[PDB]
Amino acid sequence: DAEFRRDSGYEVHHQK
Amino acid sequence: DAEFRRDSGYEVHHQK
Ligand SMILES: [Zn+2]
């Protein structure tokens, strides 16, 4: 979801 | 590489 689907990281698989 | 590109973990790309 968009608020944590951020460009400024990432590997989103380790965030929620 | 194949030896540690295993199902026996994993997210190989930064795990060991
Ligand atoms: Zn990862």
**CA B8 to ligand 1 center in whole angstroms:** 15
Q: What is the DSSP letter of B15?
A: -
> What distance in Å separates the CA atoms of residue A11 and residue B4, rounded to the nearest whole number?
20
CA dihedral A11, A12, B1, B7 (to 10 degrees): 160
Q: How was this structure determined?
A: NMR
Token code pair at residue B4? 């540690």
**CA A11 to ligand 1 center in whole angstroms:** 6
φ, ψ for residue B12 (rounded to 5)?
-55, -25
Q: Which residues contact A11 (CB under 8 A, 6 or more apart)?
A: B14
CA distances from B11 to A2, A3, B14 (A): 24, 24, 7
> What distance in Å separates the CA atoms of residue B4 and residue B13, rounded to the nearest whole number?
10
